[PDB]
Amino acid sequence: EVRTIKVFTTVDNINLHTQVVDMSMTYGQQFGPTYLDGADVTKIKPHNSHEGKTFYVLPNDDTLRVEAFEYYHTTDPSFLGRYMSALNHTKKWKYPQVNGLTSIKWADNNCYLATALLTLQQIELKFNPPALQDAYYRARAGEAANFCALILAYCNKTVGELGDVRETMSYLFQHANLDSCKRVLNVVCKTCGQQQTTLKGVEAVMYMGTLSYEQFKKGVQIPCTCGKQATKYLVQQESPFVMMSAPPAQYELKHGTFTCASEYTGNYQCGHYKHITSKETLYCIDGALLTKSSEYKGPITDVFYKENSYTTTIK
Numbered sequence: 001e002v003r004t005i006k007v008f009t010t011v012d013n014i015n016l017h018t019q020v021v022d023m024s025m026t027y028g029q030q031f032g033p034t035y036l037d038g039a040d041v042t043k044i045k046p047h048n049s050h051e052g053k054t055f056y057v058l059p060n061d062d063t064l065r066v067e068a069f070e071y072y073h074t075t076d077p078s079f080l081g082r083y084m085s086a087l088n089h090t091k092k093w094k095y096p097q098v099n100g101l102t103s104i105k106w107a108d109n110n111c112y113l114a115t116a117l118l119t120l121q122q123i124e125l126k127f128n129p130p131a132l133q134d135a136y137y138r139a140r141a142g143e144a145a146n147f148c149a150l151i152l153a154y155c156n157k158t159v160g161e162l163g164d165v166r167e168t169m170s171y172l173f174q175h176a177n178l179d180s181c182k183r184v185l186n187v188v189c190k191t192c193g194q195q196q197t198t199l200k201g202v203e204a205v206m207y208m209g210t211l212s213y214e215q216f217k218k219g220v221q222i223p224c225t226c227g228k229q230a231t232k233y234l235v236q237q238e239s240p241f242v243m244m245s246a247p248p249a250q251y252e253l254k255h256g257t258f259t260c261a262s263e264y265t266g267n268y269q270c271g272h273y274k275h276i277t278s279k280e281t282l283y284c285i286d287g288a289l290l291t292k293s294s295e296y297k298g299p300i301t302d303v304f305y306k307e308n309s310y311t312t313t314i315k
């Protein structure tokens, strides 16, 4: 018009698209929903200080659609808006270093995110979407705002919502390279005989029902269709870690027998997670808080163990 500035739009913050905007019009009148480092500027008109800056927009043509899928590995139409909305909050959280790991100072029911982030830094895992690769690298260095906002977006959780650690890891593992992970199980009924099953990928590293990896190797009792109880035991395992999960229950963690774990106090509606890690002693990381002990007992819901290759001796 009488008057313009130059700005750049983007969906990945790497590839930029030159634009000239009229300063008498809102960004939304010109681009649609528009964001400046997480802040929604759809209803704002351009300012002088905006010249030369980068704005996120939604994918609304073939070029941006391809750029967004290549970077994020999703075509959910609401993804970028949910990422930007979370980022406006996570960029204000604090990310203290606790016993050498990036944690999160408690805010907005984010305890489940803190213990997931602490867990990731203790297990061997590589992400596939460039967005997660780039953000996780930054989080390890201590600037985890983009990583947490992406976790929230991928998991369809909003800031303030209470999440579940097992479900959060399941979403993150879907976006990780676990192709070389393999699990063989055997289920034995005294009436119906035995049945072997093989699992791959995410399903090879996650089990729901018991926290103890040793008990899983000895055998755990599960329902059979004939009405009896059958025994399920681990036959073979190829993976760099395993995750055992169960509904929260009093459980004793022994120094040196596990990598890390999550503890949950509360009920179906509200609660609080803490993280326990086994190093030179047992450390309990609770957001920005840190305590130590030689023994630990509490309502544990997930335990992670190191692994490489295991073969049963059970015949």
Ligand SMILES: [Zn+2]
Binding pocket: 189, 190, 191, 192, 193, 224, 225, 226, 227, 228, 230
């Ligand atoms: Zn049976």
